[PDB]
Ligand binder design. Sequence first.
Ligand SMILES: [Mg+2]
Ligand SMILES: [Mg+2]
Ligand SMILES: [Mg+2]
Ligand SMILES: [Mg+2]
Lengths: 392, 392, 389, 392
Amino acid sequence: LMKITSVDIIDVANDFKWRPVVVKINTDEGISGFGEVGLAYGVGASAGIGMAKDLSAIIIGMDPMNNEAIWEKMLKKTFWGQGGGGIFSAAMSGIDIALWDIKGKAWGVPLYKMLGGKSREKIRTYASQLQFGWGDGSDKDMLTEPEQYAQAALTAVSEGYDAIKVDTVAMDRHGNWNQQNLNGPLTDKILRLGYDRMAAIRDAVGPDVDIIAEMHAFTDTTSAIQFGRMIEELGIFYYEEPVMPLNPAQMKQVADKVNIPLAAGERIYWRWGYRPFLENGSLSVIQPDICTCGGITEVKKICDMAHVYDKTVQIHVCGGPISTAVALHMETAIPNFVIHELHRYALLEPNTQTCKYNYLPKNGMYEVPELPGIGQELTEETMKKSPTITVK
Amino acid sequence: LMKITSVDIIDVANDFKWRPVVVKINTDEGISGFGEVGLAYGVGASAGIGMAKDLSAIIIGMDPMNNEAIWEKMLKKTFWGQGGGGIFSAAMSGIDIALWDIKGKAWGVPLYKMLGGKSREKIRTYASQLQFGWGDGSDKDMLTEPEQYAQAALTAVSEGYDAIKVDTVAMDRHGNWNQQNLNGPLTDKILRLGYDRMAAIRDAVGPDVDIIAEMHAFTDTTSAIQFGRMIEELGIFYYEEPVMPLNPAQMKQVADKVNIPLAAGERIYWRWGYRPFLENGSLSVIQPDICTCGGITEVKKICDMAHVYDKTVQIHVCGGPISTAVALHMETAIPNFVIHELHRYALLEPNTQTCKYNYLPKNGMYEVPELPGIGQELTEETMKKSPTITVK
Amino acid sequence: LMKITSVDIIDVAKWRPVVVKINTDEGISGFGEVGLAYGVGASAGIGMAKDLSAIIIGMDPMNNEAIWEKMLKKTFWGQGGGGIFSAAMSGIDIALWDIKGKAWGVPLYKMLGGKSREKIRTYASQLQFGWGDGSDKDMLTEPEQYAQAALTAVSEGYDAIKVDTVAMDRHGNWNQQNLNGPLTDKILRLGYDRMAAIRDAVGPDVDIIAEMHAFTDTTSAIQFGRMIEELGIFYYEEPVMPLNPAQMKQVADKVNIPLAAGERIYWRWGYRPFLENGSLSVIQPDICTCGGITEVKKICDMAHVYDKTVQIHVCGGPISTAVALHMETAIPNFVIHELHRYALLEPNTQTCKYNYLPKNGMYEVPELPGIGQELTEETMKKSPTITVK
Amino acid sequence: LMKITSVDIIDVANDFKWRPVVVKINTDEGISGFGEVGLAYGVGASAGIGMAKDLSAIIIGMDPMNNEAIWEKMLKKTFWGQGGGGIFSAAMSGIDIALWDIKGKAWGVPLYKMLGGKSREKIRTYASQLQFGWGDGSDKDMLTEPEQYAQAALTAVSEGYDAIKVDTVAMDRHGNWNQQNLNGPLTDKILRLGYDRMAAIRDAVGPDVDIIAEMHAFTDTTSAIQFGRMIEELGIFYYEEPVMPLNPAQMKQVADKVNIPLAAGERIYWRWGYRPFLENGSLSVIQPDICTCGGITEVKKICDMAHVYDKTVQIHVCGGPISTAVALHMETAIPNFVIHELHRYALLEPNTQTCKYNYLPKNGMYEVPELPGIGQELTEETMKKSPTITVK
Ligand SMILES: [Mg+2]
Ligand SMILES: [Mg+2]
Ligand SMILES: [Mg+2]
Ligand SMILES: [Mg+2]
């Protein structure tokens, strides 16, 4: 049997703010696994590093082949595991991913096969976050006008995407992001702008291009209902994060009043996190992030449990190539996949250059990696220039 | 990629009615996988053979590595899969187990490792169904008197077992098995015999040997409650199948009125079958049979879902060596294992000689197989003399 | 008292109707049918009927209640339920009612509580495969073809049709798209365009049932149902599978069309959660799949408390048709009878002794003792048969 | 108006693993506030440091008087706040407390007056975690025998304590802590030891000393019920953390089956975390830790909301003197207080020397600090030798 000998927690140096963090798990047989901690944006990345560092201390000396036992150890033997949480879970996730990488390298087998094989040959993708533009030379667009939203959609369509996602509310008319109060009942003008932008897209792309309406949970229950009712007639594919998950009854209230399938999951963690949303019937599409919401071991369980309640799965992807890789593996294997999320930045050099292999979509579709393990690793150059903590 | 080229459905010849049925899936690469259809007792083994035969027709030519996709095809593309059922499920299960056998043989790895590794080093066992005796020369005991029940428990203890299970109700005083009407409110004498037998066991073995009370769903709600209340004081480990699963509210009513943890699951199939019992909180211990209740792919998902509602798992085992092997692998990998079921016949030559390898418990503990795949196969001699349908 | 002496389990000479023939020492034989003639599982139904027959040899066939309870309670696997298990149970059960009627010289409907109606209204079922003669093969693709097939059925006197307009793609492939989850508009727009073409052709006074075969899931069932609401849909059949009854309730909550299901829902126990959750308006048990005469009568009775009406699911041979007609004659809560095209045609009807055909969209019930239907001697001669004694 | 100018995140050096972490918030007016991040034990203190660091970045420049607006910013403008979590919450908490310390210093008023004044003159205390002994020279103990547990209780009573808490289950007979599997149905001997130790205590102290049974969530639903039913007759004051909070229905199941009032809260965070336990009626006593479960702003709100459902409050305290101080203030102001938690280590030199002031219980009772703010600060000497990150 192999033994974990050290773990590196890598604060990935990049040219893009943006803080991808990688877990590299090392064995006495010289097989190393790579995982990603999914807190690259928002406020928390330093906490993910210290969390990954703290959890690493407790797995040194263990057999990395025992992912189920290691997952449950991190849940049950850490004290704070049993109260749950996003920082806790994201660090767990990176470690878990790295254990599956090792597992696949040990056997010479790509992740998807270890998750039950090839349930589909190609992965349908959508162009994500169109409020920030699409196409080359759109690298920091802050779109304000309906016509600009329509044009970004059309550019994505011309690139072979038959689905887009967009938050049309959170940018004000002056290009300020998320600086208005969108909680409670809102004056018509605040949401009419969002409506006109969305209706411009639909008018431009026609009925056979799917549109996902993303709210980022910047709205609350009331404003999420008010906006969702407005966009109902636009044929919305699903309605993402209308409200935060802290009281699951609020999501149910949105679902009761808005006739569009709801999606959430990037901020819902583990099977326990999803449970109340499966039981209350509020979600149609679930969006766990493999790098945030529990790792490969737990997200597979999530997807399997959600199938009982007829949910389909769009993995949330907002990190480095490692995050993309593991998402493609999961989406390839599961029966209840719907669509993959592609950010514009994920195609770009400062992202792709961090890692050894470059998997890119063609005509709106990905194919799964075929190398042993997750099929993705940081380059040596990135590791050399990235501040690193090493636990042994 | 490999291809399924033929499937043999094997009506296993044995010296023991008893009708073990084996599914042997063969590939163009010469790797064959073995699985078991768990209908060896009760009424329906011939139907399981014809079911396996019919399902085999739709998997010929498929890549056997895609067990997720194949499982979902058997659910969704058969018509009858989507109505569920025990015969349908048991055939699916035998095919599914054979697919994991292939997977393990392809990679050179034992099953427990592909299910997430070795979560425990030994597997605790109970001596099951003591009403039929225990010890050598007890080969068709039909025990009637409390003292006989005590003695059989004591024999089991002397062999290193620190837990037993027994149905003390279904034998009448004359040695007739399941021939009284045990439905509705019952005269005290009918259940007093059961209680007296159970109390004799507890007195004989003391407090530190566990007793499971098995009812085989021969009782209904009213009599299960009447009996469960009587035996509460005897320190019952769990109370098994007090009522059939067809209306899950009935199990809940028993749970509310009886202060012993309930167990069930050998006649409850798939994630969908467990769902109402998880949601209504009636079961403390779940008992899926891997060979009846959906195979490896599905019973792993059952066990994972059950952990959210704090259920522990005793795999139901009542078939040949193949059934025991797959149970051991599942029980080694899962976090939420409690105990393994050992029947007396499973130790005996007419059972063990059907298969190539001989895994036997020692001082009430099993260890898991280590050979590639499930680590168990029929012998060539058994396959030679066993009536076989071949699908190609 | 008579005694069962033997049972023949008959593989009637993909399409695999299976017949149970129960034989007595008094020379009365009863016929029933195991309702797995399509899908995957007919060989299992044979083995199941074989195994179940072993437990009824030597029994008085007049005791159908005790025999049904024995198959539930004394088989082990009965108490976990299931479609193969229930279908074999059904075929045996039907044969026992046949014996009972033959013994007394009375037709089944009378033994089920009499003639509650004189005629049985029928719909032309599964129009995506065409209607009329020479439409044996048909795999219809275009909206106008769907309307034409509907119009043909109307001209034969049918005032109601059923059609699945979604399961055939534009190229005539059957059930080869993924219809799970939220769907691109075009995938369902084709089904809508087909359905709206039928409505426009037949007018408001011809009923249309939308059949989904549970090929959709909750999300896509809701998306399609909402699309077709405006078309005046009679009911909306099997939008989702029955495995989690809460899913059916979710479709019912979001789609303003009465829901129907039952061909894959078995026994009083299987119907219970759908009665308690309010999801179904119309129930569709198959007498040959979902428990037999004894049990399907109880299903119909229980459903009446919850104001459900009943369309028996019929997709088998003439024996299946016969027993449906008897049940639908006696029950108070009948709505409509299902007629498939193939059921009218020689290869189906020739298997059996008597030919009950509808006229002007109406059936009448058989009047002979028992179920009033039997395999011909010639069919039994050439059909592979297991005999249990 | 004042401005936050810098924040020090202090890894408190100490002669006790044990990792107190202090947030010191510094203003343009030279008023500094002290808070504590409640993650001093278990796995995750490094995460709490990085989380406090990341959160501090967002409040530099803000008016520290606006604790409501700062709290909601940390909730709403961080992304991850809206998914919740223990590390996230604990860092928010340290910051929040330091804001109230500033507020009280600015006005010249102790915290309790700012929380609604003095609702009681003394604060009743229990001697906590008796499995580790009580008295001087016990720093030390890993108690195994019933008689030892009885003696520790007697020593506590002699010091003026009329209440104790103890986990009698998690030490085995050999003095190993939390090393047995306590999930699922359990053989009698595992719990009989715990029962005997607890009955020994009750016999020793008589009826008028309160005993709290602490379980640490090392049990699950089934074993929590098994043990609670055994100790029912011993007159247990409340039953603490019988099961983890991840599925609130599990707490409800213990409540239904065990006739002892339940307590939990050290791993339940914010109003939103308590909500389902209030709605389902499972908890009788709530135990939020001010340093983990949201800070003073949020924990006040928790106690107020809980009062509608007739819950009483025992603040969870297991950190440094700053933790104690803030707990005393909250418990003084709120109407629905029951009892205070005192660990042995909290009286000891390595703990108390970390901070400027020494508040000690007398005869089982504490009194509240009276200085401006929380009335507690690290010493200059501690701050000099403590590894410190400064954000500005
Ligand atoms: Mg999002
Ligand atoms: Mg059993
Ligand atoms: Mg149908
Ligand atoms: Mg505690």
